[PDB]
Design a protein around this motif. Structure first.
Motif, PDB file in Angstrom:
ATOM      1  N   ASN A   1       0.654   4.505   1.289  1.00 46.79           N
ATOM      2  CA  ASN A   1       0.769   5.524   2.314  1.00 46.79           C
ATOM      3  C   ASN A   1       1.347   4.964   3.618  1.00 46.79           C
ATOM      4  OD1 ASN A   1      -0.469   7.864   0.903  1.00 46.79           O
ATOM      5  ND2 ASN A   1      -2.213   6.450   0.771  1.00 46.79           N
TER       6      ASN A   1
ATOM      7  N   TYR B   1      -5.776   7.138  10.795  1.00 47.90           N
ATOM      8  CA  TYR B   1      -5.133   6.753   9.544  1.00 47.90           C
ATOM      9  C   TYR B   1      -6.050   5.848   8.720  1.00 47.90           C
ATOM     10  CZ  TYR B   1      -2.094   4.102   6.370  1.00 47.90           C
ATOM     11  OH  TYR B   1      -1.594   3.417   5.282  1.00 47.90           O
TER      12      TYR B   1
ATOM     13  N   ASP C   1      -5.691   2.081   1.528  1.00 47.90           N
ATOM     14  CA  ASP C   1      -4.693   1.407   2.329  1.00 47.90           C
ATOM     15  C   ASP C   1      -5.353   0.484   3.338  1.00 47.90           C
ATOM     16  OD1 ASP C   1      -3.589   4.246   1.536  1.00 47.90           O
ATOM     17  OD2 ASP C   1      -1.759   3.046   1.965  1.00 47.90           O
TER      18      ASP C   1
ATOM     19  N   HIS D   1       0.860  -1.174   0.000  1.00 45.09           N
ATOM     20  CA  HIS D   1       0.000   0.000   0.000  1.00 45.09           C
ATOM     21  C   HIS D   1       0.901   1.231   0.000  1.00 45.09           C
ATOM     22  CE1 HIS D   1       0.606   0.992   4.357  1.00 45.09           C
ATOM     23  NE2 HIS D   1       1.021  -0.257   4.323  1.00 45.09           N
TER      24      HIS D   1
ATOM     25  N   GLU E   1      -8.922   7.836   7.274  1.00 44.08           N
ATOM     26  CA  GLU E   1      -8.488   8.807   6.271  1.00 44.08           C
ATOM     27  C   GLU E   1      -7.897   8.153   5.018  1.00 44.08           C
ATOM     28  OE1 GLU E   1      -5.853  11.440   8.447  1.00 44.08           O
ATOM     29  OE2 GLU E   1      -7.534  12.513   9.336  1.00 44.08           O
ATOM     30  N   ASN E   2      -7.536   6.865   5.088  1.00 44.66           N
ATOM     31  CA  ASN E   2      -6.884   6.211   3.962  1.00 44.66           C
ATOM     32  C   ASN E   2      -7.559   4.880   3.638  1.00 44.66           C
ATOM     33  OD1 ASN E   2      -4.195   7.866   3.534  1.00 44.66           O
ATOM     34  ND2 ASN E   2      -4.551   7.721   5.736  1.00 44.66           N
TER      35      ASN E   2
END
Ligand SMILES: Nc1ncnc2c1ncn2[C@@H]1O[C@H](COP(=O)(O)OP(=O)(O)NP(=O)(O)O)[C@@H](O)[C@H]1O
Ligand SMILES: Nc1ncnc2c1ncn2[C@@H]1O[C@H](COP(=O)(O)OP(=O)(O)NP(=O)(O)O)[C@@H](O)[C@H]1O
Ligand SMILES: [Cl-]
Ligand SMILES: [Cl-]
Ligand SMILES: [Mg+2]
Ligand SMILES: [Mg+2]
Ligand code: NA
Ligand code: NA
Ligand code: NA
Ligand code: NA
Lengths: 384, 384
Positions: free
Chosen positions: A236, A352, A359, A234, A355-356
Motif C-alpha cells: 500500500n 496510514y 504495511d 509492502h 489503518e495499514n
C-alpha cells in the motif's frame, strides 16, 4: 583611473549575455542548454495549472532548435500602456516583467521572477514567437534578443496558444550543444504524472522518435513507476493531497528492498534537485511519526537515516509565493512550507500506519534492519 | 481577464523586495541576513585584491546595524554622464551596474553581477553611505532603497575609503533577525588567511568583544588552523601557488587521522559552499595522481573516496570572469577552472610525493586503510 566613467550600467538583456551563469546555470555541461527548454515548458505548464491548457507539444527540430506549443490563453499581444510596445515584446526584452507578480492571472505558478523566457530569448541566436489569441495569429522574430519587427498579425484562427521556437547561441553554449531526447523525456514524463489530464507530446524530427505522456493516477502512479525496476516491500503506497492555510501538500511514498533514498521534491511543479524546506519538513515528520509509532507499539535506536533507506517518495507542494535561491530553482527557501509539509505528514502518516498494520509492521522491520546494518558497519570500520 | 494590463514591469529595486530569495537567499534562517554583511565585505576585499585596501573594519552596532569601513579607493562620486546622478547612487539604486564588467578597475574580483550592494540597500530599512575620495567626505542616506537627498560633500579629508552602514528591514527578514558575532568572525578569519597583509577587524558594540585578524602564511597556515583540533598524520603540508593561462590556482592540503573530508573551495575569495568545477578538478587530479604513484611504487582497489577520508584542503582560484549559478555564489559553474586546477594539481602533487617520501608512504598507508575499512563495512552490511 577609477571614477564615474568606470561604472557601467547593463541595459535590456545585456546582463544575461554578460553573466549567463546566474540566469541559465552551466553553459558547458548541457544542463543550461536543456534548461532553456524547461523555462519555456514551465510557462506552458503554468497555463495548465491555471486551467487553460490541455496539450503541450515539444519538438526537437532537425536544425537543433526546439519548439514548444501550448493551447493556453496566449501571451498577451496588446500594446503595453506604460512601455509602448506589445506586452509580448515587453516580456521578451525586459527582465522582471510578467503576469505572475500577483495571483490574478495565475493562482499558482512555477513562474515567479519575470525572467525566464527573456533569458531564453537573450541566449538564442534566433527566436520565433507565434501567438494565437482574440481570433488572430501574431508572429515575431528575434535575433540575439533583438526584435526584427514589431509583433504583427499574420492571419485568423479559432484557437488560442503560444508557440516559442528557439535556436540557442553558440557564443554562449559550449561543449554539449545538441539536445538530448532522454533529458527532455524524463522531465516531460514527470510533468505528466504531476499534471493529470494534460496531454504532453515529445517529437524528435531528427529520427522520428515520439512519445505521448498522459499518465493517470498522479503522484501515486509516479511512485509505482519509480519503484518499477525495484522491489517494493509492502503493497500500500502512502498517499494524500490536502490544501490547508493556502498551501497544497501532496505526498506519495513506498519502501523498497534496496538501500537508496530517493525523494523527489516539487514546488508548483518545478523540481528542486537541491531540496529545500519541503524536503526538510518531510524528513522531520517521517522521523517523528515513525518514532512515535514504534514507541507506542513497543518496537523501540533508529535515526532519520534508517527510515530513509529504501524509500521512494514524491513531495509536491502548491504555494502562492514560494522563494527559490536562484533562477534555476534548484532549492526551495520558504520556511512556512517546511511547517505545512511537516504538519500534514505527521497527521496523515500516523493515520496510514494505524489503518495499514501489515504495511506498518513491514516498514518497522525495515527500519530496524537498516539500524542493525548501520551499527554492524560502524563496528566493522572501528575494528580495521 | 488575462491581457496587456496583466503584465507588470518591476522597476528600480522593486524586484529585489518582491523576490528576495533569488538575490539574498533564505530570509528566515539567518543565512540571508548575514549575507547582507558579506556582500559589503566582498566589495572591500575586491579593493584589497586590486591592491588599494589594507584595512577593513566590520562593526556590529548596538542597534542591530552593521557597518563596514575600508581604506580603498572609495565608490566613485562624480555624476554619471548617462544616468545624471552620482555614480554612487547609480550603484545603490540600479541592478547590473558597476565597475567589474571589464578588468580595468579590478583585474580580479569576487564581484561580477553589479547587484550586491543594491540588494543590501533594497532590503534595508535604512542605509548610510560615507565615501572618502578626492579630498572630500561624501554622505548619503537611503530608506528602503530610496535616497533621501543627492550625494553631498560634508567636509575634507586626506583619506580614501568607503563606509556602508545598514539596518536590515524586518519586512523582509524574519526569525533570525540579530547578527551573530561568530558567523561574521568565521568568514573574516578565512578572508585574513586568503588575504595576507590586509588587517581585518571585527567589533561588537553590544558587548565590547573584538578581534583583529591578520594571519600570515596564507592558505598553508589556514590548513594548520583547520587541522588544529585534529591529528595530522604527516608533517609536510602540500602547497603551491601558480598562475597559468590567466588562471591562478593555489592549493594546500594535509591528511589527518580522522574520517571526514573537508575541502574549502574559493573563487576570487568567495566560498563555494556547494562546490563546483574547481572542486571537481581537485578531486579528479587527486585520484589520478595518487593512483599513478601507487601503481609506480607497487602499492596497488582504492577509489576517489578512500583518498578523501581524513583530508583537509583549501582550493583557491583567481579567475578573470568566473560563472556562478546564483547571486549568493554557492557554486562555481566554469568548466575551464576544472581543467586549470586538474592540470596544476597533477603536476605539483606528483612532484610533492617524489620529494617527500615519508609523507607519501604515510598517505598511501592511509588510503589503503580507508579502502580496508570501506570493504569491511560493506561485508558487514551484506551479512546482517
Ligand atoms: N506560454 C505562455 N502562455 C501565456 N502566457 C505566457 C506564456 N509564457 C509566458 N507568458 C507570460 O509571460 C510572462 C513572463 O514569463 P517569463 O519570462 O517566463 O517569467 P515568469 O514565468 O513570469 N517567471 P520566471 O519563469 O520564474 O522567471 C509570464 O508571467 C506570463 O504572463
Ligand atoms: N567598497 C567599495 N569600494 C569601491 N568601489 C566599490 C565598493 N563597493 C562597491 N563598489 C563599486 O560598486 C560597484 C557595484 O558593487 P555591487 O552592487 O556589489 O556589484 P559588483 O561588486 O560589481 N558585483 P556583485 O557583488 O557580484 O553583484 C562595484 O563594481 C564597484 O565599482
Ligand atoms: Cl568620480
Ligand atoms: Cl492583450
Ligand atoms: Mg516563466
Ligand atoms: Mg559586489
Ligand atoms: Na522578461
Ligand atoms: Na503569483
Ligand atoms: Na547596483
Ligand atoms: Na571583471
Amino acid at each position: 583611473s577609477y571614477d564615474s566613467s568606470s561604472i557601467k550600467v547593463l541595459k535590456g538583456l545585456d546582463a544575461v549575455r554578460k553573466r549567463p551563469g546566474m540566469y541559465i546555470g552551466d553553459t558547458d555541461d548541457g544542463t543550461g542548454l536543456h534548461h532553456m527548454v524547461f523555462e519555456v515548458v514551465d510557462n506552458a505548464i503554468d497555463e495548465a495549472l491555471a486551467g487553460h491548457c490541455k496539450e503541450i507539444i515539444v519538438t526537437i527540430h532537425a536544425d537543433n532548435s526546439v519548439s514548444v506549443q501550448d493551447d493556453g490563453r496566449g501571451i498577451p499581444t496588446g500594446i503595453h500602456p506604460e512601455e509602448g510596445v506589445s506586452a509580448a515584446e515587453v516580456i521578451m526584452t525586459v527582465l522582471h516583467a510578467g503576469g505572475k507578480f500577483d495571483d490574478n492571472s495565475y493562482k499558482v505558478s512555477g513562474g515567479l521572477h519575470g525572467v525566464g523566457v527573456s533569458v531564453v530569448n537573450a541566449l538564442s541566436q534566433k527566436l520565433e514567437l507565434v501567438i494565437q489569441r482574440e481570433g488572430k495569429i501574431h508572429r515575431q522574430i528575434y535575433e540575439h534578443g533583438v526584435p526584427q519587427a514589431p509583433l504583427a498579425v499574420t492571419g485568423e484562427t479559432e484557437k488560442t496558444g503560444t508557440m516559442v521556437r528557439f535556436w540557442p547561441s553558440l557564443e554562449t553554449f559550449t561543449n554539449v550543444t545538441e539536445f538530448e531526447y532522454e533529458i527532455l523525456a524524463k522531465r516531460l514524463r514527470e510533468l505528466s504524472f504531476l499534471n493529470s489530464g494534460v496531454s504532453i507530446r515529445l517529437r524528435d524530427k531528427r529520427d522520428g522518435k515520439e512519445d505521448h505522456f498522459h499518465y493517470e493516477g498522479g503522484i501515486k502512479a509516479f511512485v509505482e513507476y519509480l519503484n518499477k525496476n525495484k522491489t517494493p516491500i509492502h503493497p500500500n503506497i502512502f498517499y494524500f493531497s490536502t490544501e490547508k492555510d493556502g498551501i497544497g501538500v501532496e505526498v506519495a511514498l513506498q519502501w523498497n528492498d534496496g538501500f537508496q533514498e530517493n525523494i523527489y521534491c516539487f514546488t508548483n511543479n518545478i523540481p528542486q534537485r537541491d531540496g529545500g524546506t519541503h524536503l526538510a519538513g518531510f524528513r522531520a515528520a517521517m522521523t517523528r511519526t515513525l518514532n512515535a509509532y514504534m514507541d507506542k507499539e513497543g518496537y523501540s535506536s533508529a535515526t532519520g537515516d534508517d527510515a530513509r533507506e529504501g524509500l521512494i517518495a514524491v513531495v509536491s507542494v502548491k504555494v502562492p509565493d514560494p522563494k527559490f535561491s536562484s533562477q534555476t530553482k534548484d532549492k526551495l527557501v520558504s520556511s512556512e512550507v517546511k511547517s505545512a509539509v511537516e504538519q500534514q505528514m505527521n497527521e496523515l502518516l500516523a493515520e496510514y500506519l494505524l489503518e495499514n498494520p501489515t504495511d506498518a509492521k513491514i516498514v518497522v522491520g525495515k527500519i530496524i534492519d537498516a539500524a542493525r546494518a548501520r551499527e554492524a558497519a560502524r563496528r566493522a570500520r572501528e575494528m580495521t
